[model samples]
Target: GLTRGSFPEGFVFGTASAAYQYEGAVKEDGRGQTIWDTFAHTFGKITDFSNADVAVDQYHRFEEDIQLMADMGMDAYRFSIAWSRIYPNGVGQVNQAGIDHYNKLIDALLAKGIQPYVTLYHWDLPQALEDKYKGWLDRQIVDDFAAYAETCFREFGDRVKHWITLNEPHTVAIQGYDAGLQAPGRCSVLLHLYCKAGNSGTEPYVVAHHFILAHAAAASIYRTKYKATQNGQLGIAFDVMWFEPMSNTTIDIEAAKRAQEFQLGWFADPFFFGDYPATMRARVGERLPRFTADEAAVVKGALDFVGINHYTTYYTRHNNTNIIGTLLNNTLADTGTVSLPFKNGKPIGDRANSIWLYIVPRGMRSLMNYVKERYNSPPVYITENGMDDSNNPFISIKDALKDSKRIKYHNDYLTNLAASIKEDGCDVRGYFAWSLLDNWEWAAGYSSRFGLYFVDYKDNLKRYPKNSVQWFKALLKT
Candidate 1:
């Protein structure tokens, strides 16, 4: 069943994990509480009433985990450093113990001959920071994040060469903030509206403006200070889902474009050209933040590569009467944009393990081509992509999770990715399967398994390879 010769030579096959998700010794070795800790402990939240307080126990078992990576023939292993681990209070005091843990992890990976791809922040905001400055909502976080990033560069730059500043800021903004589905979950559709309204002309744009500044500041620190002396690359990751207009009508097409602008263009435009997209400006009005010449110069050309995390695509349509209060006129909603029993289309429905993650492989290729054409062909890394399979107690047998569905998901996505690289000529450098082990699935808790290695939480945290693991191993061996 292994398609041994499918991938091209030098194609990277690897897996990824986030700190809070895997490293579950939450209170050990001077580790500070993260927002996730706070979010989970606030009773009646986090649907499953579960938290990552003792996830996969990777903090203690990372050595064993890296051995798994070695066995899988992983070319690169992408993992994020925990912010709370480094800065318990999110500023001022540096935790040497946290640094040591990361240093040990990085050294361990390098020792295994696996290239380490480090993500600076992965939504696990230090609870202390939120207590002091309202987390991402506060403008001062821009500077604090830069300081944090600089510390990492100075400390680990010698060993780790590929640095990712932020993982999926869009998700950080939308899911975590707007949709209230993630940690530090704040349902702020109005907040997004405020950011959009003030984007071009006023105060709410100030918040959105600060994120741009923070991203640039972090990138500048890496580019000017670290890249030359440390000899490393720095980039930010953006999460995008492909969107097509619901109809050939002009309004629907415009709605689709608005959705794209809101997601990709909002982040990319600033890093590439040092400002928000003109379409965003025209749509959001006074909500868009203005950047000064100096700031623009600093922000522009901050990327050496573009890390894109694409999943699925949706059909979009304009909703004139459905628009809510003070929502930006140019803003697009997902209401009419989903594939339907409601709307006409060639529906290739893929059942999602979770309601949110619909599998659509062709969307991956569409987005890859879109980014390549739009962003000057920056070297791209598929930073996060995988299917979720929530465990069912009824089907408890180890062999039950052959996960042929997940294997097919990967094959479908990879086939499209291969076409993107071989035919479309996109400079896609790598693909990282979203996870390495089943851990806390934020809000959904431990139920959702995105890992190729199934984690048994009840026992010794024993990891069993799913069928997809063998498929991935074969892919890597290619």
Candidate 2:
């Protein structure tokens, strides 16, 4: 197995979590409701008919969790601040209690000698903003999101040196709007298939456009207001997949390009090149929103690094631009591309418990190289990369702890990442596994486990160090 020394010096290895997923004191300490809180509670949304009203109670048990990470010799901890927690109403008044909670969390992590990579937004938009002005769908949200972020910087920026402005903005637009499978679920195309409301094609693009501007607005505030004294690095975490053409043919190759433009290019291009991809503009046409020159100036060069949340690879190909796509207006149709987990009925590597997550280690290297070459080799962090296991009720805790699949997943992915840094010369800086402890998994509820430490949901959310934990401990020690 590769060790820490196998990678470049200062390369960080840590676990990552989201506020909504881990912190569950939803009603206390001036916390307000979020779109996630609402979505998870809605019937028929989560596969297990479960909600995270109490989650794993990380709001009360963060100290124990931090020590768990410390015991593993983790170098850092990446977590997001709940927007509604800090600004219960989204804007107008500050939630001192919410700020105090995070301040304490930050101090605790630092006391353990762990650096905090704080993400300002991780899809938990304050419901107040959504109700008042339709959330990310409105231009008003750009300032409101910035305000919420600035408040975090003002309170925690002194201690948190690594800031992520948004987590998977593309996921927010597509999953939340296009697919209607997540919070604030909205979709129009065959609403019966997804949700009762939403324009699958146009709303996704509009929300994503605003998300880009919102990130730039927040990043600009941090760079201008706090970056100098705080000396922190700020960026967005992009949810990515490594796309490969199904065949060596040019049409498939072009299809692959279209696939990426709709995914990575939809979000990152604005940060580096100042706008959406030409393919998106030409294909989506007016459906894709445009960024004004002033907004473009703010959006370009907005980050000190890029956070990549990569997990799987897919085979992409050109499909007949479906007429249904034109009638509905969606991402798949706009790109005129199709992405699937299989090629000729064969699975892409080994499959994990999640239907969408496939194990393809070399895709990590390809993704890293893609980011380095396409985006001018900006500093990159593997912000989230981990697979999951099923939360089967029949399995004993001891048996469940023997997560050999997860151990192999990380070992193989890290090996490829190390190669990307050393052999391929990718400008990679750090790596954060998708989670620390098994907690809430949005629409999946608690049915999926993606943690180094297993949480016994039936046993007072107790933590058990899985076999993968031991693997990480030994790797970090060396």
Candidate 3:
């Protein structure tokens, strides 16, 4: 049985949350509009036709929520500070009210003996920036992001020690720009059948380039200006899905390798080796952004740790024919691989509420080893890992709270994570559950629930612990 004592002595345990997903008071405390607000408001975007206007109301009930985490014996709480809140316009005059709100939030966490792991921007790009210069598409975002990050360091750095600059930039770049299913939705895929405008091929790459640079720029400022005094650690939370070769063939194996290169390596390679993988450069060619010597110098070795958000794994194989490449010309085509969660008629693992989320526990072990070998065994954190359930209104809250499936999911995944750290010698230091409460899920809206605590949306957003909460409580209890 995996428990707190199953791993290393100082390994941290926590739950993660994003500001936009959990916080409800969108207009309170001088908070500015964000791309998510705009995107959710636009018709036909969110599947359930729901926006996060009053999302779980955590913005008002954070004290109550922090107590929930403490009750579960969590040592830390990972949450993002809304970019629009801090810099309502994305730049220029500061929003003091925004600062005060987060200050109280951080203080509340600390008061409960839960260390704060603050993420600066969790895909909530200030709408003002998007209107001014198309947000992540422009090079201007690097400096603007750095300015906002610097403010957090200057103000909260005294108490907040862990900083994540960005959250899931790859997802933002792909879903927002390529698929047009998320915020700032733009895409040329399928002849613009879904989105009105966007070059699916070029925009994702351009946005990704800026994301890496933005992380570097912010890390540089933190190291140069605040690291000495604040002594805080900074990193980016990258979303990754482990890939396994579909067959024993060399082509299939190489295709699996290339799939990871296109995913994690797109952002992480620049930090580790000062540029993207050679495979990316060859396939993406001139479309892939290049770094200057000065830029590479700062981008390299910028991270104190690697923050990974891994949930599932997929089967990958070589896409020998260039049909998709010739047609869509998107980043996925450039990789020359096809990844799916099925082999024949069987799935890789059990399905979660989200179609893409398949539960394969061994993937956690494999992904940890891959990161260790690829990036020289850097300190790692399982920043986000968990499964979700369907938010079925027809079901009783009592039945929903009996989440034995989620309990097993966490147990199996945590077992693999523990093995990765103990037996495989992976430099893993922490594990943060994907969330604390069932709140807003982007695109899917509140239709999907990924929380240890079951939230009754129909009943004043009251929280009740699923059986998984008891499992974690038992594992974490001293």
Q: Per-model C-alpha lDDT, please?
A: 0.79, 0.90, 0.92
Task: Indicate the residue-level lDDT of 412 in model 2.
Answer: 95
- Give, for candidate 3, the lowest lDDT window spanning 10 residues: 320-329
RMSDs, each prediction?
Answer: 3.6, 1.2, 1.1
Best by lDDT: 3
Relative to the true structure, candidate 1 reaches a TM of: 0.91
Residue 163 local lDDT, model 1: 89
**Residues 5-67, model 2: lDDT tens digits:** 999998999999999989888899889999988898788899998888789899999999999
Q: What alpha-carbon RMSD in Å does predicted model 1 have with respect to the real structure?
A: 3.6
**lDDT, model 2, position 226:** 94
lDDT computed for candidate 2: 0.90
Clashing pairs in 3: none
Reference-based TM-score, model 3: 0.98
For model 1, residues 56-155, the per-residue Cα lDDT tens digits are: 9999999999988887789889999998899999998999998999999999999999989999998888999888977887888999999999999999
